[PDB]
Amino acid sequence: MNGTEGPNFYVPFSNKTGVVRSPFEAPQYYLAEPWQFSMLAAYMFLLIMLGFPINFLTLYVTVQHKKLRTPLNYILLNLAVADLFMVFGGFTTTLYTSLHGYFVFGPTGCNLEGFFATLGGEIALWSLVVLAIERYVVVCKPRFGENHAIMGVAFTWVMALACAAPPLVGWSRYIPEGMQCSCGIDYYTPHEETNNESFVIYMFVVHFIIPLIVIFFCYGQLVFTKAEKEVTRMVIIMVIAFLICWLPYAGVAFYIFTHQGSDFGPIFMTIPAFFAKTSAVYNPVIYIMMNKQFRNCMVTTLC
Amino acid sequence: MNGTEGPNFYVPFSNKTGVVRSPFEAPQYYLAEPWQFSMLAAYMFLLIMLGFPINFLTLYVTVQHKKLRTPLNYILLNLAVADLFMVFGGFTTTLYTSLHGYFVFGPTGCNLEGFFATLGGEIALWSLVVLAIERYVVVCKPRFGENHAIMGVAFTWVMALACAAPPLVGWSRYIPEGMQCSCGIDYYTPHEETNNESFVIYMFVVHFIIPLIVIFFCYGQLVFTQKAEKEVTRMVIIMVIAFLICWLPYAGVAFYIFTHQGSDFGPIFMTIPAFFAKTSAVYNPVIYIMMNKQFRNCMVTTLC
Ligand SMILES: *[C@@H]1O[C@H](CO)[C@@H](O[C@@H]2O[C@H](CO)[C@@H](O)[C@H](O)[C@H]2NC(C)=O)[C@H](O)[C@H]1NC(C)=O
Ligand SMILES: *[C@@H]1O[C@H](CO)[C@@H](O[C@@H]2O[C@H](CO)[C@@H](O)[C@H](O)[C@H]2NC(C)=O)[C@H](O)[C@H]1NC(C)=O
Ligand SMILES: CCCCCCCC/C=C/CCCCCCCC(=O)OC[C@H](O)CO
Ligand SMILES: CCCCCCCC/C=C/CCCCCCCC(=O)OC[C@H](O)CO
Ligand SMILES: *C/C=C(C)/C=C/C=C(C)/C=C/C1=C(C)CCCC1(C)C
Ligand SMILES: *C/C=C(C)/C=C/C=C(C)/C=C/C1=C(C)CCCC1(C)C
Ligand SMILES: *[C@@H]1O[C@H](CO)[C@@H](O)[C@H](O)[C@H]1NC(C)=O
Ligand SMILES: *[C@@H]1O[C@H](CO)[C@@H](O)[C@H](O)[C@H]1NC(C)=O
């Protein structure tokens, strides 16, 4: 191995010179200059300060205006809630971690960071599955109502927890990645005690490949066959934005899983891991730009 | 002396232990932990990312709408421009300096950071002077038009440069303060080669006390003597108050240091007032949006 494995960590840095310390015990300045940890903290502070108001204002405007009860309005409402969970539950630990250069909260902080970021990303993915069926049902007419949308909302939480929760209780585990200031799923070690390999295959199949198969099946029909046009256009951008956000992470995660112990450094996963955290803020932005009714209501309420 | 004087710095940290190093040569981790410097950089990064959009949008909306040509509109447009000089000309140096924990750009970086924040703050103060006279004439009619507003705009730049420029060319100097990641006027040392003592008196009298006397004179004449005019007077009251909240803590601590040179204070003493004052680049367009209905509608129109 070209890294350093400990009981609950894998540092992508060789301990041949003896300088590697646990990311739960001391600042990781042996693998990066302090000013680089400070950039990660400036970034996270931005995401929190931007992420909280824009998701709260999406939530506030939707509840205030009773005309926002289409299935799209419910789904965007649900995304704002999970985004708030990501900001307050996970990103506050990311900020404090990146400020101090290591996981000052110990493994409990690593679990919070990884869990809330995994949960929110999966709620967004399975939300895209719901919108793909609604668009397929309404446009093709093979009626999608409030009951269906509200059932879809509960479905996204169940699927997301089926992915985010097991690493909390012994199936795989959350481990620090990159510069050791964020946590994800353990793609790095075998660690048979927690049956790591079977979780990763289950995560990539059930909660990455299968949802994308559903989404692209439905769009395949719409391709191969005015207010609804506005909805369909927004859902196309949301699918594209999701892929830009998560594919770099997904690709590096899968490379590491199939090249365990190989020669990669700490920046390799740091950048796709922190870019993926923009997932907590981009969805309401698309909402404001591409939904005229929601934009008018936000302008009305805020002014 | 309870601090360490260098050729071009004064570190508020004793060198009896030998660890003090120049803020132009090495990170200043001997007087604060690295996570404390990271907070300054995170704070500076927020200000840059908020400061550029709201000032640029304030500029853009004002130019695009012919009906925003009152003296208030001209003064606010001029504040947006100066705020943008603060963000791009000075705050970018602050961000780099906080990230690395010392002035990697050396003395030139200290001059940019101090000059643009001093220039921006003083344009704001002399702008309040201009608005106080305009309100004074408007309410009492003892007329203030578009030529006067543009003349006032030019006046605020000349006065601000008469405060910020001399320290670039040998009357006083810009010097790091606090945790050594921002710069201000040298209240710390006598340094007779730059006649430090006379500049601070000139700054506090001409560029602090005289302007406040003018502002509060015109308010006092007004306090003892339609809808649109009342809206303008209300916003000017808030602008004066917001200036005092932003700058009085800094001016108070600066004047205390001037009169207690070499006394026992640490790096946090000036750091917090110095960085709080940097919010001056942001708050003025926010009052404008909240309290001017014509401007707010023109931005909603422009933005949507
Ligand atoms: C990296 O190597 C160093 C040096 O071998 C390890 O530090 C030693 O750890 C043992 C066990 O705790 C101590 O008894 C020694 O005294 C340590 N030596 C020194 C010089 O500190 C270190 O634990 C290794 N790091 C990791 C993460 O495994
Ligand atoms: C603070 O004190 C230290 C310790 O005396 C100074 O370091 C010395 O500086 C001289 C002048 O450059 C060198 O010749 C010595 O070799 C240094 N000694 C050590 C142990 O480093 C340091 O210059 C002082 N700092 C300030 C800002 O005055
Ligand atoms: C901790 C894990 C939790 C996982 C599970 C999360 C489930 C979230 C759903 C809540 C139901 C909310 C019901 C709100 C009902 C609103 C109904 C409405 O607005 O319309 C009514 C309409 O008349 C109909 O025909
Ligand atoms: C639809 C819009 C899509 C927009 C987004 C497109 C993303 C393209 C890149 C994906 C990441 C692929 C990761 C592959 C990593 C291979 C790295 C490798 O081989 O590097 C070895 C080296 O040793 C390491 O240090
Ligand atoms: C900074 C916090 C991070 C990087 C959290 C990571 C969370 C995951 C391991 C998420 C996995 C995925 C999604 C939520 C959507 C795309 C598919 C996955 C399985 C890669
Ligand atoms: C971080 C940048 C700083 C601290 C800039 C400092 C600027 C000054 C020296 C400002 C001076 C003043 C004003 C602009 C208004 C209030 C009165 C003064 C003279 C203290
Ligand atoms: C470590 O890196 C070298 C060079 O890239 C590689 O040949 C070796 O297989 C790596 N070790 C493991 C366990 O993959
Ligand atoms: C340094 O601090 C001590 C204690 O407050 C004080 O007695 C002394 O006068 C200070 N030195 C100077 C030069 O003010």
Numbering used by the authors:
A (entry chain A): 1 to 142, 147 to 229, 245 to 322
B (entry chain B): 1 to 142, 147 to 229, 244 to 322
Reproduce text from the manuscript describing this model.
Rhodopsin, the vertebrate receptor for low-light vision, is concentrated within the disk membranes of rod cells in the retina. Rhodopsin transforms the absorption of light into a physiological signal through conformational changes that activate the intracellular G protein transducin—a member of the Gi/o/t family—initiating a signalling cascade, resulting in electrical impulses sent to the brain and ultimately leading to visual perception. A photon is absorbed by the 11-cis retinal chromophore of rhodopsin, which isomerizes within 200 femtoseconds to the all-trans conformation, thereby initiating the cellular signal transduction processes that ultimately lead to vision.
To characterize the structure of Batho-Rh, we collected TR-SFX data at the Swiss and Japanese XFELs from LCP-grown microcrystals of rhodopsin photoactivated under a regime in which laser-induced heating is low and in which we recovered high-quality difference electron density maps below the maximum activation using a femtosecond-pump laser with a 480-nm wavelength for three time delays of photoactivation of ∆t = 1 ps, 10 ps and 100 ps. As mammalian rhodopsin evolves along its reaction pathway, some of the observed changes will become more pronounced while others will revert. By Δt = 10 and 100 ps, the β-ionone ring and C19–C20 methyl groups still interact respectively with Gly1213.36–Glu1223.37 and the tyrosines of the Glu181ECL2 polar cage (Fig. 3e,f and Extended Data Fig. 7 (top)), while, for example, Tyr2686.51 and Pro2676.50 of TM6 relax to their initial positions.
